[PDB]
Amino acid sequence: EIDYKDIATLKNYITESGKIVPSRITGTRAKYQRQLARAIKRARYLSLLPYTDRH
Amino acid sequence: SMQDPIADMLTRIRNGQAANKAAVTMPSSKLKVAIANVLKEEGFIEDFKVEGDTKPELELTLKYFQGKAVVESIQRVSRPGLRIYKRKDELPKVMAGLGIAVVSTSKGVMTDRAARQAGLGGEIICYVA
Amino acid sequence: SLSTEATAKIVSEFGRDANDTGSTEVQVALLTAQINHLQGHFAEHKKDHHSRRGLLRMVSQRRKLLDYLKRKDVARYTQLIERLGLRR
Amino acid sequence: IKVRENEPFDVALRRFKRSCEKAGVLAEVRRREFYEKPTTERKRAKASAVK
Amino acid sequence: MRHYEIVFMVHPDQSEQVPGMIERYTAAITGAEGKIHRLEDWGRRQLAYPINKLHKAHYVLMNVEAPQEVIDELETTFRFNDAVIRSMVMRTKHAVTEAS
Amino acid sequence: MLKAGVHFGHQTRYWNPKMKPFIFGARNKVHIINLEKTVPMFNEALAELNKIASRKGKILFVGTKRAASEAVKDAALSCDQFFVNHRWLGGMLTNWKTVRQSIKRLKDLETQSQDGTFDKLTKKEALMRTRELEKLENSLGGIKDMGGLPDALFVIDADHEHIAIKEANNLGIPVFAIVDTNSDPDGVDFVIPGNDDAIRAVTLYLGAVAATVREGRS
RNA sequence: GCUUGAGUCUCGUAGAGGGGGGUAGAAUUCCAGGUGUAGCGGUGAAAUGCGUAGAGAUCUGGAGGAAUACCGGUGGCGAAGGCGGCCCCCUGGACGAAGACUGACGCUCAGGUGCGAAAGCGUGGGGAGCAAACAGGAUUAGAUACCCUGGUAGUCCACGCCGUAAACGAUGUCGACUUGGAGGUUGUGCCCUUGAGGCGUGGCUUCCGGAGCUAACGCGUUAAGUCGACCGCCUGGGGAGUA
Ligand SMILES: [Mg+2]
Ligand SMILES: [Mg+2]
Ligand SMILES: [Mg+2]
Ligand SMILES: [Mg+2]
Ligand SMILES: [Mg+2]
Ligand SMILES: [Mg+2]
Ligand SMILES: [Mg+2]
Ligand SMILES: [Mg+2]
Ligand SMILES: [Mg+2]
Ligand SMILES: [Mg+2]
Ligand SMILES: [Mg+2]
Ligand SMILES: [Mg+2]
Fold this sequence. Notes:
This is part of a larger assembly, with chains A, B, C, D, E and F.
Chain D: H1 25-29, H2 38-42, H3 44-48
Chain E: E1 2-4, E2 9-10, H1 18-31, E3 36-45, E4 57-66, H2 70-80, E5 84-86
Antiparallel strand pairs in E: 1-4, 2-4, 2-5, 3-4
Chain F: H1 35-38, H2 45-53, E1 61-62, H3 75-78, E2 83-84, H4 100-110, H5 127-137, E3 154-155, H6 162-171, E4 176-178, E5 190-192, H7 201-213
Parallel strand pairs in F: 1-2, 1-3, 3-4, 4-5
The structure holds magnesium ion (12 copies).
Chain C binds one RNA strand through α1, α2 and α3.
């Protein structure tokens, strides 16, 4: 959210597989859901978070 | 665009009226006034009011007689796109005579009954009935 | 789209004073500024079609403003285009 | 995806797969490209999902 | 002058060229009259998925204020240097300290 | 001035723009009507109401809803007054001439309840004919005899009684009615603001109307 | 002259707005190798095709192109076309809050100029998947098709052409005016921030609906209502958007 480094706060917006959880489920707001996903995509790149559960 | 205020007046009226709106306001001007005058003096509005100084504000009080509005129809006639001018003998009469036509003459904005009696003619600003 | 420092500099080089911000001459000059700046952005790239639209908008804006001044104070007009360096 | 089911039981217990993959993004990607037509699809997925 | 996050990660077998690197990149930014608002030698960390073969790799965080120029040549030096298995210079909007 | 203890206003959004002039509401997601503008509508209300009730009052306390039907078959029913407290059989005014015999069947049947044939035919026919009569009774009670043609009309819930009011408007029948905030006025000549489906504003004004027909000229 | 029309200035906000460069994982195809062995593939059913030179299946390493799952949403941006991984650099527009500056500098616009999906053309690249043409296999009375096995241009990049689409809201642009209701999105002011909020106040957006309008269907403060300014265009079908 505020940050991609927040893997702790972040890891509760994704499933087992690692899939981003839709706003509809988490009930988040709009503006932030984006901030969220961005911060997630960031973390995935920096190997701080699995794109996949294929490991 | 602003381009034709006088229609905007005629209209802000026409509309508010149809919206059984008590009053109605708008940017003022020498001209708006002279017509608001004839409009009151001929008893199509209660009374006007210009409340400002640097940015004047015409305000008209509307009327309603039965349930209806008093102004049953108000149209432009001359306009920037197409000016109308009539000579005295060629002045128009609304609803056969009932209701009136605002005409501006070399002796000021007056009705058709008026300008006719004054023996002259000018630009026929609008019709009202 | 141009700096605060830069834009300031020119208000302060064209108007009565910083604050006389909307002075004809000033607008023109801080337009003229951005247009020229830009010439190099579009030098490279060139296919930045969208941004190009904004630039023309700058030119035609400036064009209308220049037209205004000239009608108003011709004296001020001429000084301008000299000092700004255009209207070959 | 994964079930590391433990001790006492023999049943599959993988109702997991009806929560994401399989016919999900699979019946999806299987065939006609789509392109601008999903738009027409999903434009009914809201007209519906209004009520 | 702008800021950026910046967070290069380094191959284990080049682990202790990390002190030299940080030294260097900071010497580089300071040199150009730029500050440095945070620094964090996260050391050997485990990877969310194996990248480049090999798991676990050495992370380093930074947070700089520097001109688009040194930040340019950083990103390159990061390519030149095939010891840094990833990198990513990021947003900005005003300095930052502590987090993590 | 006020008399309506707790009928204040009622009805949340669902408000009808044309009902603004009688609203001063705004309490927690719901309009209170303009209490101090309802009562000047008992003036005029029970006035031309009575002013005719002494010229001879024929009324029609029309008001329905399994939640105030009985509370209308009351002193509302009793006096110089007729009523309807069930589904407003549409066209019952505008088609009175057809319906006039839906009456004949009501009487020519109950007039024959403890009379005529009755305990005879079959004990099938029995309550299988009092169902004919039961049905008729409600929605066609108050009508029974209409001696003096429906002359004014007093309705509880303006719009809920679309049809009733409409017919009146069509046949030139005064229509006195109370209109919640949500309902559409102008169908009603003599309009009465305030709540229209709560056990009070009913009874109150309802009962209070019974009190002005039931006495005008001794 | 005037300041409200229109600009300029200040700090911010959101954004698949544009251009350039860098980069990531998932899959497909291919190449190499382990294990493994007679089928795989495909259809309505088949066959063509692929496999004993070991296929398909599985595992590992590698090459390459193309597009970016999830987020994702009657969500967002752009004049329209249209724009979705992530990062930097360059850059256009929009909106909001304060006041400060200009002082009618405006609107529209035949001609003109620019932009403009896909296909298509020109030189060079590039080529995994897809696929006009073409080949094979089926279906069928026929089958120049729909289905199958293949597969060339093309689809990708640079440079330059073409200038068209149901390029559509089939609704020209600007302005003013006229009851409402429930959302979405995005600024901003105030309130023991003491609630994940409470009350306002802009920009944009969806649904519904009033007057009114309409041949009707429908539209309805984002008008197809009420008015004005300018432009475009229509005048029976076919012939013909042809000569
Ligand atoms: Mg691969
Ligand atoms: Mg492989
Ligand atoms: Mg910008
Ligand atoms: Mg072009
Ligand atoms: Mg193309
Ligand atoms: Mg080509
Ligand atoms: Mg084929
Ligand atoms: Mg065409
Ligand atoms: Mg509608
Ligand atoms: Mg609305
Ligand atoms: Mg219009
Ligand atoms: Mg031709």
